[PDB]
Write a protein that binds this ligand. Structure first.
Ligand SMILES: O=CCCCC[C@@H]1SC[C@@H]2NC(=O)N[C@@H]21
Ligand SMILES: O=CCCCC[C@@H]1SC[C@@H]2NC(=O)N[C@@H]21
Lengths: 541, 90, 541
């Protein structure tokens, strides 16, 4: 029996209020800025590179994905801003690689396509990190991996940051071998040249497809062959679909053109003999009772002002229905049960400074979700931990550690959304990047750093005021901002969402109006893997 | 007119039924002051409902709950469980 | 293909026959006696206690259950007669506690509610036993436990029978901890005062709900606080929803009144993320081909007369369809396959004195059901084992033991119904209380004891006739009934169904016309737990 009437969250905001008008205007500008920057990244290398790419009969990388996925299906792209201003004078739109989750033949798959228009598809250090992140997502959720291979090899000027280390280019083949051993299909589509390590990708795949003339697979390229043995051979003769398809045997399928190869890929996925099974209970979906775009006015762009996280929850959960847990205890933290697109979810969101009661309340809640195998969603808007002599005497650190330890051991799928600040140990307790959430997203107004910019400035303003008061040479107020202004600028620049997203610290910057859709797609993908039993460590009582 | 039914807004259906009921209209003595002359008769207050009618309404809530129980049963694996009955029997 | 026509059990009884008329009249009187006694127990403490209970704004205990369970759903109450005349001068209707199985939010749950109108909710020795029996049922069938806590603590005058032993009050918290570790939800609803051990129940629960002003939780009550420290504090200040909800943190949900708390409880159960799965094959249900009330005439109240157990079977199984196993071998025992409300069941019922062939036939049948994971139903109407020099020489004890040993090790759900006598070792072979049947019910005409009253009388009439014949002082016939009449009275009084049910030896006395419904509800609840593989001991061939 599910006919019981229940209360719903959310309240109608005052659209006429000046605060709402200002907050909407500021957030809208950030979203517009985000949209137009993505439009530029959409163009990849540029008109000249794109014209050259098409002149060879090859499809553009994003057109390949459009044709690969099911007609009209949504595509969840990841880390669109990787490499954004990362390198001083080189522009690398999207890191030279496009990764995302889409539906192929009714199966959710991870798609990893090299962007040949960007630096000829060379692998920059960020390119390796983006690919490794995609492989990690695919393995944790048992998503088949499809590699649209069109690459130019490693970027020699930065080889030390690509080749040697554990998380360097070598790890890519290690991940392929491990996923294959777990029956997570690895499909490679050679739609271009692949050289040196690139040739290993088709070789390490379970099933492989190569285009008739564009594709080439050589461990040593023609330039190396000539230098080593003084022989002149074309790339097609050294590699090519015909040689590998008919003589070398490296090719499992032979494709006439890009369209044919994509059609073959869809057939390969259909033969995986895989059917999705859900471990969680399901209920019919319902839209939230409030418009999502109102989040612009409610949240704004000023992190100093505070808002009720329940308002954010009311606009993303099915029917704006929410069962709060321990509502009046540790009120700075909000925990409760809801449903997104029919899936059950336990939501943990910050509503102020973390206290001992808040940490205890969170630790209790996380155990409940793990016991019932309920996915967890974290909404990070932190401002730090309570600071005080009494709080330390009562083991706030001991309480805060309780939550870091429960969150780490939880085996239910975890998704983190940074809707505000993320500073210090508060990041760890709220399932930061270091704690392996299945996905991590940030809003365009977020800030992340070891501590807030002001705190670092004020702290230094104590150390050197002390330095010269205790030493005895006086240190004046103008000497204070020759100390504080450079610090605040640095933390503002390095805490910017684009700075965080340019490096792969999050999986993307998302428009707040799209929060519900992104969460729905992410949780749906995460449910492809069975939920395991959670084993906890010692709870330091 | 009694089979014409509208829910969600106010309507003149009740006034029309009262006007048709009025004896003078049935006689055919119609004049354009009919509504002002018979204004008190045409607009009439609600009377208290009979206990019988209240019994019918109670049955309606009970039967609607039974239908809701039936809907859940169709989704359930245990379709024939005695608990899914709405017998209210101890 | 299930279109085969099959034979059906049952025959039309001779309604005009004098035996049927007498048997119907006697059984009807017993049922009427049972009904009116339950009506009195329904009233609990009484009008004055009930008026006082309502005057405090609290719902009556049975009204709480009505509002908790799904609208119109049946409620299977257990041990209604616990404490019936158990204590010399104290009336304890239902033992001061109401336990049963009902559907909450579409999930079968065990509900344990203290009856505050009975002795202020104090825990009598039978009260602990009734609660422990309910917890045992919930654990064996994986039923979530809901505690409607309104208690006054242990009954001090009888503390030695409540506190110390393994099956005493302490075991209640042990059961809660064990079920929680197995993911069997424990939900406590504090709708009144709970003191000393009572305060542990909300603390030991996975999720907890407390009413605004009625509920109070404290390890030490105000009376103990004053004696220990000489401080005067009200119960609300010492405990109360506000203190625990907001300061102590013992409360997970805060409720305005009893209605609000019950509404919250339904929400909590809906978030358990549990869905029932059946291990057995299911077929459409069908009503029996004969009226159930005819069981009155067929069975009667005279245990000396015998009836065909097949007649009882024909009136409870779907369509009165029954496949008998080894019909002509060991005919004193009836075994076969049937279906009740669509569930498959193997039925074992007595049809006379147990023989070596009957025990062997039963042992063979029990192995069949365990192999196929088919629930077992036992219908006990025993009169003893075959007595004879030849039977002992052929190992009747060895044969009888074969059945005791197979029945004990069987892991399929087992339900026992005593429709007649239950004496001696015949009780053990037919899955008595000692053999952990999931449920055990008795008809109002049943008798249970170590042996029949007459046998004990006759046996003593041999021992003392011998005592004085062998000693030499003559012992006359009138001396015989000064021996026999007290024995027969004792066994009649202690074998009465109410005597057995007042103590928790069975789960209730049920009207024969309700047998099919009770079995259907019981088997449905027992199927919430997966059926395990059966491991047998050594079969002494
Ligand atoms: O060292 C200079 C270039 C020509 C010699 C390099 C040799 S060829 C055999 C071996 N394989 C390589 O890739 N490099 C060395
Ligand atoms: O013994 C007489 C009553 C007052 C003293 C009892 C003390 S108070 C501390 C401790 N806790 C109890 O419940 N009883 C003892």
């Amino acid at each position: 029996y599910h006919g019981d009437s229940v209360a719903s969250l959310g309240t109608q905001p005052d659209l006429g209020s000046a605060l709402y008008q200002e907050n909407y205007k500021q957030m809208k500008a950030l979203v517009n800025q985000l949209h137009e920057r993505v439009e530029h990244i959409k163009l990849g290398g540029g008109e000249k590179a794109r014209a050259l790419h098409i002149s060879r009969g090859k499809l553009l990388p994003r057109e390949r994905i459009d044709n690969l996925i099911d007609p009209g299906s949504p595509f969840l792209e990841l880390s669109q801003f990787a490499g954004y201003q990362l390198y001083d004078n080189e522009e690398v739109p999207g890191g030279g690689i496009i990764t995302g989750i889409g539906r192929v033949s009714g199966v959710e798959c991870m798609i990893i396509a090299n962007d040949a228009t960007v630096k000829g598809g060379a692998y920059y250090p960020v390119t390796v990190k983006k690919q490794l992140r995609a492989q990690e997502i695919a393995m944790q959720n048992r998503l088949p991996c499809i590699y649209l291979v069109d690459s130019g090899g490693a970027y020699l000027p930065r080889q030390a940051d690509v080749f040697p280390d554990r998380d360097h280019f070598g790890r890519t083949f290690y991940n392929q071998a491990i996923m294959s051993s777990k029956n997570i299909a690895q499909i490679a589509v050679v739609m271009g040249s692949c050289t040196a390590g690139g040739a290993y990708v088709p070789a390490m795949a379970d099933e492989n497809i190569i285009v008739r003339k564009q594709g080439t697979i050589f461990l040593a390229g023609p330039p190396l062959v000539k230098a080593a043995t003084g022989e002149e051979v074309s790339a097609e003769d050294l590699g090519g679909a015909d040689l590998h398809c008919r003589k070398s045997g490296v090719s499992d399928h032979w494709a006439l053109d890009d369209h044919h190869a994509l059609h073959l890929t869809r057939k390969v996925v259909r033969n995986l003999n895989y059917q999705k099974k859900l471990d969680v209970t399901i209920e019919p979906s319902e839209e939230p009772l409030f418009p999502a775009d109102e989040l612009y006015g409610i949240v704004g762009a000023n992190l100093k002002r505070s808002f009720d996280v329940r308002e954010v929850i009311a606009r993303i959960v099915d029917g704006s229905r929410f069962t709060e847990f321990k509502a009046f205890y540790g009120d700075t933290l909000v925990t409760g049960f809801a449903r997104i697109f029919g899936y059950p979810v336990g939501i943990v969101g910050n509503n102020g400074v973390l206290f001992s009661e808040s940490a205890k309340k969170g630790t209790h809640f996380v155990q409940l979700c793990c016991q019932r195998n309920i996915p967890l969603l974290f909404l990070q808007n932190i401002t730090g931990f309570m600071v005080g002599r009494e709080y330390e005497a009562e083991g706030i650190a001991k309480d805060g550690a309780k939550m870091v330890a429960a969150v780490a051991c939880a085996q239910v799928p975890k998704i983190t959304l940074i809707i505000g600040g993320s500073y210090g140990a508060g990041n760890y307790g709220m399932c930061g990047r270091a704690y392996s959430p299945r996905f991590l997203y940030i809003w365009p107004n977020a800030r992340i750093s070891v501590m807030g910019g002001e705190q670092a400035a004020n702290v230094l303003a104590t150390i050197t005021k002390d330095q010269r008061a205790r030493e005895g040479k006086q240190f004046s107020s103008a000497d204070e901002a020759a100390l504080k202004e450079p610090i605040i600028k640095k933390f503002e620049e390095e805490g910017n969402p684009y700075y965080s997203s340019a490096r792969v610290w999050d999986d993307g910057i998302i428009d707040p109006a799209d929060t519900r859709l992104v969460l729905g797609l992410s949780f749906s993908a995460a449910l492809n893997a069975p939920i395991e039993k959670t084993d906890f460590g010692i709870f330091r009582m | 007119l009694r089979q014409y039914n509208i829910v969600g807004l106010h309507t003149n259906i009740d006034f029309l039924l009262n006007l048709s009921g009025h004896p003078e209209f049935e006689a055919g003595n119609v004049h354009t002051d009919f509504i002002p002359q018979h204004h008190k008769q045409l607009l009439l207050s609600r009377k208290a409902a009979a206990k019988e009618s209240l019994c019918q309404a109670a049955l309606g809530l009970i039967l609607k709950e039974k239908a809701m129980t039936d809907t859940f049963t169709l989704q359930a694996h245990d379709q024939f469980s005695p608990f899914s009955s709405s017998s209210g029997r101890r």
